[PDB]
Amino acid sequence: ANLKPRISFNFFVTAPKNVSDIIPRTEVEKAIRMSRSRINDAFRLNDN
Amino acid sequence: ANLKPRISFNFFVTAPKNVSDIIPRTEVEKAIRMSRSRINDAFRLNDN
Amino acid sequence: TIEEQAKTFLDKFNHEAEDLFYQSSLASWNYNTNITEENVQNMNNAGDKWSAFLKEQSTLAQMYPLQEIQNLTVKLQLQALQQNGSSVLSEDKSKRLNTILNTMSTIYSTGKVCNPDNPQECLLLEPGLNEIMANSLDYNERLWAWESWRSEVGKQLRPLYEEYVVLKNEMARANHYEDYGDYWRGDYEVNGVDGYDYSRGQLIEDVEHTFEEIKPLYEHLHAYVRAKLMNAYPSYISPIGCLPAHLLGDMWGRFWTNLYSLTVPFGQKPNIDVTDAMVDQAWDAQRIFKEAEKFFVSVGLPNMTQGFWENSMLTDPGNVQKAVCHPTAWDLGKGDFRILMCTKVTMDDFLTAHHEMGHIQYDMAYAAQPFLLRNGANEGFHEAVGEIMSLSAATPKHLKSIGLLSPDFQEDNETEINFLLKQALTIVGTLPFTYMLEKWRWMVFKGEIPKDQWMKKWWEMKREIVGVVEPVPHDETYCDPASLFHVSNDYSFIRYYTRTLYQFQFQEALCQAAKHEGPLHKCDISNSTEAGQKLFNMLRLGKSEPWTLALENVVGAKNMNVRPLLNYFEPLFTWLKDQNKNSFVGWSTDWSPYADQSIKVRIS
Amino acid sequence: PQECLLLEPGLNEIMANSLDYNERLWAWESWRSEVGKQLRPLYEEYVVL
Ligand SMILES: *[C@@H]1O[C@H](CO)[C@@H](O[C@@H]2O[C@H](CO)[C@@H](O)[C@H](O)[C@H]2NC(C)=O)[C@H](O)[C@H]1NC(C)=O
Ligand SMILES: *[C@@H]1O[C@H](CO)[C@@H](O[C@@H]2O[C@H](CO)[C@@H](O)[C@H](O)[C@H]2NC(C)=O)[C@H](O)[C@H]1NC(C)=O
Ligand SMILES: *[C@@H]1O[C@H](CO)[C@@H](O[C@@H]2O[C@H](CO)[C@@H](O)[C@H](O)[C@H]2NC(C)=O)[C@H](O)[C@H]1NC(C)=O
Numbered sequence: 001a002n003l004k005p006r007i008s009f010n011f012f013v014t015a016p017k018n019v020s021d022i023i024p025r026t027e028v029e030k031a032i033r034m035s036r037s038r039i040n041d042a043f044r045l046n047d048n
Numbered sequence: 049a050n051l052k053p054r055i056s057f058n059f060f061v062t063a064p065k066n067v068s069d070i071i072p073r074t075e076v077e078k079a080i081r082m083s084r085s086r087i088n089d090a091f092r093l094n095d096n
Numbered sequence: 097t098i099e100e101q102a103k104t105f106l107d108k109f110n111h112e113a114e115d116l117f118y119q120s121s122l123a124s125w126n127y128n129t130n131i132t133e134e135n136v137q138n139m140n141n142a143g144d145k146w147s148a149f150l151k152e153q154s155t156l157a158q159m160y161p162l163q164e165i166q167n168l169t170v171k172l173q174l175q176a177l178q179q180n181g182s183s184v185l186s187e188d189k190s191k192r193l194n195t196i197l198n199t200m201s202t203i204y205s206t207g208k209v210c211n212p213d214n215p216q217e218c219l220l221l222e223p224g225l226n227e228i229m230a231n232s233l234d235y236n237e238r239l240w241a242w243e244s245w246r247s248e249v250g251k252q253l254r255p256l257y258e259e260y261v262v263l264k265n266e267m268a269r270a271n272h273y274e275d276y277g278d279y280w281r282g283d284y285e286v287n288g289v290d291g292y293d294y295s296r297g298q299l300i301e302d303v304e305h306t307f308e309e310i311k312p313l314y315e316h317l318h319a320y321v322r323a324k325l326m327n328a329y330p331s332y333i334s335p336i337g338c339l340p341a342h343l344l345g346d347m348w349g350r351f352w353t354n355l356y357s358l359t360v361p362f363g364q365k366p367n368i369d370v371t372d373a374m375v376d377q378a379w380d381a382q383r384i385f386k387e388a389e390k391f392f393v394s395v396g397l398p399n400m401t402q403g404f405w406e407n408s409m410l411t412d413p414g415n416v417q418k419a420v421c422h423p424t425a426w427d428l429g430k431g432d433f434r435i436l437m438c439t440k441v442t443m444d445d446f447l448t449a450h451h452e453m454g455h456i457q458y459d460m461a462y463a464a465q466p467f468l469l470r471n472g473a474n475e476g477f478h479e480a481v482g483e484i485m486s487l488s489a490a491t492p493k494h495l496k497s498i499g500l501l502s503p504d505f506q507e508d509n510e511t512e513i514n515f516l517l518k519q520a521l522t523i524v525g526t527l528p529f530t531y532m533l534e535k536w537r538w539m540v541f542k543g544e545i546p547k548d549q550w551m552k553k554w555w556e557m558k559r560e561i562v563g564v565v566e567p568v569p570h571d572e573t574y575c576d577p578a579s580l581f582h583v584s585n586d587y588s589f590i591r592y593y594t595r596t597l598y599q600f601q602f603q604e605a606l607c608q609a610a611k612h613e614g615p616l617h618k619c620d621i622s623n624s625t626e627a628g629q630k631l632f633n634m635l636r637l638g639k640s641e642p643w644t645l646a647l648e649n650v651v652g653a654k655n656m657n658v659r660p661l662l663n664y665f666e667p668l669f670t671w672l673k674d675q676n677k678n679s680f681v682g683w684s685t686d687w688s689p690y691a692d693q694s695i696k697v698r699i700s
Numbered sequence: 701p702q703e704c705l706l707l708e709p710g711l712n713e714i715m716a717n718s719l720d721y722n723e724r725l726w727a728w729e730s731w732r733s734e735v736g737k738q739l740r741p742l743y744e745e746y747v748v749l
């Protein structure tokens with residue numbers, strides 16, 4: 001949501017097929033902590 | 049198809065929703081030539 | 097002389113037109129009444145036989161140039177024939193258009209969505225999906241239905257609507273209009289009558305200028321409903337935000353009626369119902385239509401006619417003799433009128449009877465006019481008469497006089513509120529939605545919204561005008577507005593706004609003739625003949641006069657007003673202003689049901 | 701996507717009458733994909749029981 005020039009958007013994750021089931025934010029904040037080093041190089045960005 | 053220990057498999061691409069429409073191989077061999085440098089680092093491999 | 101030339105052509109037209117129309121309508125009547133496969137194709141034969149006559153006459157009438165005619169009443173009929181319509185397109189284009197139109201409606205009428213758990217039980221919209229949204233109290237179920245209908249059906253209509261816009265715009269520009277939008281406002285336009293003029297561009301000014309006076313009342317009605325939803329769905333609605341779009345009773349949010357059971361002010365007192373005092377007095381579906389006729393006679397209007405009693409469908413046949421009972425009035429022309437409805441002994445049918453007889457009493461008035469001038473003064477006058485007739489036959493000051501509602505029965509000032517708020521959930525609940533929807537389409541049809549900002553502007557106007565926020569973000573691959581019936585079936589949607597305003601202008605201007613004293617919502621025009629004249633001077637005009645001149649003959653002004661609608665809801669506005677002391681009237685357009693679990697990303 | 705086909709009529713006559721390669725392949729693959737995929741987690745339990 002809210003794509004923009006700065007490219008700063010918002011995102012959230014739901015269960016596979018259950019639109020009313022939002023994965024709590026404090027778990028998305030952990031999966032990304034786990035695989036950030038692998039999300040980065042997919043785009044060549046560098047954590048800053 | 050044919051996943052194995054060596055991890056050497058085969059793959060092919062079809063149209064979005066048309067199972068009987070196989071993209072000819074000489075175009076998959078060009079898309080991959082175009083974006084190989086970006087497929088590599090997603091896995092940290094190095095073209096060898 | 098061009099004048100006489102036309103004058104003679106119209107005369108010759110009238111006869112053929114009228115007879116073919118008679119034969120064409122009788123077929124459809126026989127079909128709708130007596131469903132037989134045989135009658136289906138007969139109706140098609142008669143219909144095409146008539147419809148071809150229209151094309152022949154339209155081309156044949158294109159000769160006489162307009163700017164010579166002085167007699168206004170013939171310059172008015174000619175304008176209805178010279179209209180090229182959609183024939184001005186190409187051939188391949190004109191038959192691509194009909195294909196798109198028939199594909200869009202079929203998707204709406206047959207598309208189905210089905211459960212994630214058991215993918216074998218699929219649900220249509222007509223039954224099933226509507227009753228879920230109209231009856232459920234389960235947050236997750238409502239959200240599933242609301243999102244899945246827009247996802248598995250909206251997504252199909254998008255690439256078709258994108259073509260429909262383009263084609264309809266050419267069809268309009270080839271008729272000396274600016275676009276389709278300016279084509280639709282072609283109904284409210286008047287030209288050269290010395291002070292009764294009305295330009296297609298003024299309609300936008302009037303609509304946007306009367307809406308700024310309903311915002312004070314809609315804000316309070318919106319802030320009160322929100323405070324009563326935070327008890328049925330706690331922890332889901334913030335008290336300074338908007339309302340999630342799927343908790344509004346209906347699939348789209350057009351009417352808030354289905355929120356009555358959650359928002360009734362005084363739940364103990366029951367509303368006025370007489371569906372039982374009719375059974376105890378043995379009222380069959382013929383004493384109803386006699387009471388309606390008597391009510392109309394009391395005002396001053398004339399009786400019914402023999403043919404009306406003879407050839408009508410006041411009752412359901414009951415056997416496998418099949419029929420449709422969507423209640424309608426029929427004006428087959430040549431001098432017969434007839435109603436069609438499967439009547440049940442109830443109250444909501446005791447009102448629908450008055451409503452339909454309203455249309456019938458309209459038609460009987462202007463049936464002395466040339467065939468092309470037999471219609472409402474504009475599109476929003478017909479159904480704005482049936483209403484004001486069904487609005488004055490539900491008042492206890494009338495029910496306790498027709499015989500029901502035992503005479504020792506005084507109403508208290510709490511059922512008054514119980515009733516007004518049931519009205520306001522339907523009248524005032526749908527004014528901002530209608531205005532926003534037509535504004536969006538008027539802006540799409542003129543390229544003021546690029547083809548990649550449709551949904552963005554849609555959900556930007558929703559939060560700002562209607563005060564309703566979506567529960568999941570919708571990108572540009574969706575098309576939500578095309579999921580409504582009127583949008584995906586090519587129907588103008590502004591009649592439902594202006595009708596609501598005329599409905600109360602008439603009611604307010606008629607009670608002053610009947611010498612009413614109390615509040616407006618307790619007025620009753622029965623037994624007042626001097627208030628049947630003021631109404632009969634407007635019905636007996638058809639389309640022969642500019643609609644502003646028709647309004648002037650009743651209200652005394654020449655434009656739609658919004659003051660009389662606010663005098664109707666005064667006893668509710670006061671009570672609402674009192675009940676909203678410790679709340680926050682208004683809303684802030686940044687809250688969203690998913691903004692507390694979203695993560696923000698920023699890339700350089 | 702509005703015209704759905706059962707197996708008993710329709711899907712059988714396609715496979716038994718057609719001579720079009722792509723149509724046969726579409727039917728053969730889609731019946732196994734949109735129905736086989738459902739029976740798998742049930743068959744896995746049925747075996748065990
Ligand atoms: C989708 O996820 C929701 C959770 O957000 C599930 O709703 C739960 O349903 C169970 C029983 O039906 C209730 O006991 C829970 O209270 C519900 N959750 C909440 C937050 O109220 C829902 O069942 C899921 N959908 C499916 C098909 O499993
Ligand atoms: C799926 O792709 C195939 C191509 O492999 C399409 O088949 C073509 O269909 C057209 C007309 O139907 C024929 O003229 C071609 O000869 C077909 N291709 C071959 C290789 O024979 C098929 O139409 C596609 N499916 C859909 C739904 O479009
Ligand atoms: C409904 O329509 C059917 C025909 O579609 C009518 O059947 C006719 O009945 C009359 C007797 O009154 C026969 O003389 C005709 O031969 C019948 N027509 C056919 C095609 O069978 C039926 O009468 C209609 N119902 C009513 C109430 O008029």
Ligand SMILES: *[C@@H]1O[C@H](CO)[C@@H](O[C@@H]2O[C@H](CO)[C@@H](O)[C@H](O)[C@H]2NC(C)=O)[C@H](O)[C@H]1NC(C)=O
Binds near residue numbers: 103167168169170
């Ligand atoms: C416009 O033309 C109509 C005729 O089409 C005129 O209506 C006629 O008026 C005279 C006298 O008022 C009647 O005797 C005729 O019967 C009317 N004709 C019809 C068909 O009913 C009308 O008067 C003309 N308008 C003006 C302003 O003169």
Ligand SMILES: *[C@@H]1O[C@H](CO)[C@@H](O[C@@H]2O[C@H](CO)[C@@H](O)[C@H](O)[C@H]2NC(C)=O)[C@H](O)[C@H]1NC(C)=O
Binds near residue numbers: 158179
């Ligand atoms: C209706 O469409 C026609 C074209 O089909 C427009 O053009 C006129 O067509 C007639 C033939 O019937 C010619 O005699 C005229 O010379 C044409 N007019 C022009 C300006 O070329 C016609 O103008 C259209 N009328 C309306 C009211 O839209």
Ligand SMILES: *[C@@H]1O[C@H](CO)[C@@H](O[C@@H]2O[C@H](CO)[C@@H](O)[C@H](O)[C@H]2NC(C)=O)[C@H](O)[C@H]1NC(C)=O
Binds near residue numbers: 496497498622
């Ligand atoms: C219209 O007026 C008539 C007569 O003025 C009312 O009919 C009277 O109704 C009362 C109570 O229902 C009876 O006691 C009288 O006997 C009736 N009089 C006649 C002559 O029938 C009628 O009720 C009024 N209608 C409304 C809606 O007020």
Ligand SMILES: *[C@@H]1O[C@H](CO)[C@@H](O[C@@H]2O[C@H](CO)[C@@H](O)[C@H](O)[C@H]2NC(C)=O)[C@H](O)[C@H]1NC(C)=O
Binds near residue numbers: 509510513
């Ligand atoms: C209905 O009318 C009654 C009588 O006028 C109202 O009751 C009074 O309301 C005032 C206003 O606050 C109080 O000061 C009185 O104490 C009330 N009287 C009693 C006996 O309680 C009542 O408020 C009105 N209801 C509505 C919804 O307006």
Ligand SMILES: *[C@@H]1O[C@H](CO)[C@@H](O)[C@H](O)[C@H]1NC(C)=O
Binds near residue numbers: 393399
């Ligand atoms: C209308 O018809 C009734 C008969 O049902 C009659 O008594 C009444 O007088 C008629 N109305 C007028 C105005 O003549």
Ligand SMILES: [Zn+2]
Binds near residue numbers: 451452
């Ligand atoms: Zn009506």
